[PDB]
Design a protein around this ligand. Structure first.
Ligand SMILES: Nc1ncnc2c1ncn2[C@@H]1O[C@H](COP(=O)(O)OP(=O)(O)NP(=O)(O)O)[C@@H](O)[C@H]1O
Ligand SMILES: [Mn+2]
Ligand SMILES: [Mn+2]
Lengths: 149, 343
């Protein structure tokens, strides 16, 4: 099928701390170790990104993300159970259950695209979120200082 | 030798002068909606679609791209859209689609381009499966010359892909979709393009330059010769993971020269990537894969095209897929006027 273009928000640099315990930071870093955009960050960028991630407390039955909505946040599970279902041609189907661990919304860190699924908390829970724009500003501002050529 | 065939020094110098002059002096409302009969949709996009139209007075056919202003604002593409029109109206090259007219009304922005009836290279590539290396080389040479031209003007194209390359009646390429084209003298940062064609530096927000276009050419050549892109997966993240790794696998039928060219274009380290070294584009023009390329004949469009789309006459859209049609409605209230004044 023909491939559509993608485009994120512009930010020409050339032209934010959410307190966390040492334990919380370590667990969070360990959960993003396999995330593409994180694996490629320099140590200082990682530290700044981890500081920017905010806590998102959720109540049972609460919808973390609704399929089709605009996506601007990436989430990593800290605790709690979540359900994952996708509506296909009108047919709602469960695609699994989260159990206190996991991550989702990774693509939101690059550009906005409709959420591919709805994720609802099936019990009290907590997640760590990261805004795409906040993330980009951090990485770009830091990389803008690097000499090139 | 390849680079010694044609002398482009003074040509690029004059082309730059002409571009700068036109870039600073775009025309506004050089036509209006009621001067065209809308015939059929040739393709659709996020802001609207491109329709085949007939200029009522001259009878000539054109391709009109319609962009819904409110949608452009919502998707935060105001700057890109203004750049698209301002740059396209200022460039001139044998392989670039020509912008004939442009205008706007209460609801949309309109770019009337010359109609390229041959269809997207994408459709032909998907139907044929894969192009022979000579066939792929014919198209590649045209892109090489086009980027040499665009880059000399300090422009970056940013969306090279078969879907944006149209085949004209002589079988030559006509680059369309300047949606992401931008004047860049140092480096830029917007994450944009098409997934399969994004260079590693774009994906990772490292800041980038014209080298991303050369990377995209590597992706294009590979796709043309293999029938599929070098980095592919059913999900975007997986595509990006493969791109960043850069590990590429070549079909067994790829010639040694092709593989070498591709290893140099698909170089993850932009400082070692062909097109971005000391000799710039000459490294590509001089590569063994292009040894049999007559760059002059390509530019003058004298080489016999390995493939020519079928044509009946003006208005023929058989080379394009069918799309759901819809009447163009123009609001009675001006939408987003302030943001698009320059258009
Ligand atoms: N001058 C032209 N002549 C004929 N067909 C054209 C012309 N320009 C564009 N098209 C067709 O219309 C389609 C849409 O135009 P395009 O400029 O690529 O839309 P877009 O919204 O920018 N697409 P994209 O950003 O890649 O997702 C193209 O893929 C071609 O099939
Ligand atoms: Mn396009
Ligand atoms: Mn586009």
């Amino acid at each position: 099928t023909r491939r559509a273009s993608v485009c994120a928000e512009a930010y020409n640099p050339d032209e934010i701390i959410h307190p966390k315990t040492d334990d919380q930071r370590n667990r969070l870093q360990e959960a993003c170790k396999d995330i593409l955009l994180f694996k490629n960050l320099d140590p200082e960028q990682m530290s700044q990104v981890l500081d920017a991630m905010f806590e998102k407390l959720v109540k049972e039955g609460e919808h973390v993300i609704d399929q089709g909505d605009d996506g601007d946040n990436f989430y990593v599970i800290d605790r709690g159970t979540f359900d994952i279902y996708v509506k296909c041609d009108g047919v709602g189907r469960c695609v699994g259950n989260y159990d206190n661990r996991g991550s989702f919304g990774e693509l939101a860190l690059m550009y906005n695209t409709p959420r591919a699924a709805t994720i609802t908390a099936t019990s009290p829970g907590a997640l760590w979120g990261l805004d795409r724009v906040t993330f980009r500003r951090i990485i770009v501002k830091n990389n803008a200082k690097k000499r090139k050529m | 030798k390849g680079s010694e065939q044609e002398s482009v020094k003074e040509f690029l110098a004059k082309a730059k002068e002409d571009f700068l002059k036109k870039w600073e002096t775009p025309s506004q409302n050089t036509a209006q909606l009621d001067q065209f009969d809308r015939i059929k949709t040739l393709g659709t996009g996020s802001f609207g679609r491109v329709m085949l139209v007939k200029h009522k007075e001259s009878g000539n056919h054109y391709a009109m791209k319609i962009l819904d202003k409110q949608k452009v604002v919502k998707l935060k593409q105001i700057e890109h859209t203004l750049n698209e029109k301002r740059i396209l109206q200022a460039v001139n090259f044998p392989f670039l689609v020509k912008l004939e007219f442009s205008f706007k009304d209460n609801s949309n922005l309109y770019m009337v381009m010359e109609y390229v009836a041959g269809g997207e290279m994408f459709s032909h590539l998907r139907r044929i499966g894969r192009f022979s290396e000579p066939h792929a080389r014919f198209y590649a040479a045209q892109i090489v010359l086009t980027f040499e031209y665009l880059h000399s003007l300090d422009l970056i194209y940013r969306d090279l892909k078969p879907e944006n390359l149209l085949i004209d009646q002589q079988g030559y390429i006509q680059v369309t979709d300047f949606g992401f084209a931008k004047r860049v003298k140092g480096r830029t940062w917007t994450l944009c393009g098409t997934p399969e064609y994004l260079a590693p530096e774009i994906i990772l927000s490292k800041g980038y330059n014209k080298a991303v276009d050369w990377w995209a050419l590597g992706v294009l050549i590979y796709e043309m010769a293999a029938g599929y892109p070098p980095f592919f997966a059913d999900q975007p993240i997986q595509i990006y993971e493969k791109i960043v790794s850069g590990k590429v696998r070549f079909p067994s039928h790829f010639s040694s020269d092709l593989k070498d060219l591709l290893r140099n274009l698909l170089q993850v380290d932009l400082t070692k990537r062909f097109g971005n070294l000391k000799n710039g584009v000459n490294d590509i023009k001089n590569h063994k894969w292009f040894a049999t390329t007559d760059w002059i004949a390509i530019y003058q469009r004298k080489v016999e095209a390995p493939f020519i789309p079928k044509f009946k006459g003006p208005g023929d859209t058989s080379n394009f897929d069918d799309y759901e049609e819809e009447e163009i409605r123009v609001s009675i209230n001006e939408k987003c006027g302030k943001e698009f004044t320059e258009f």
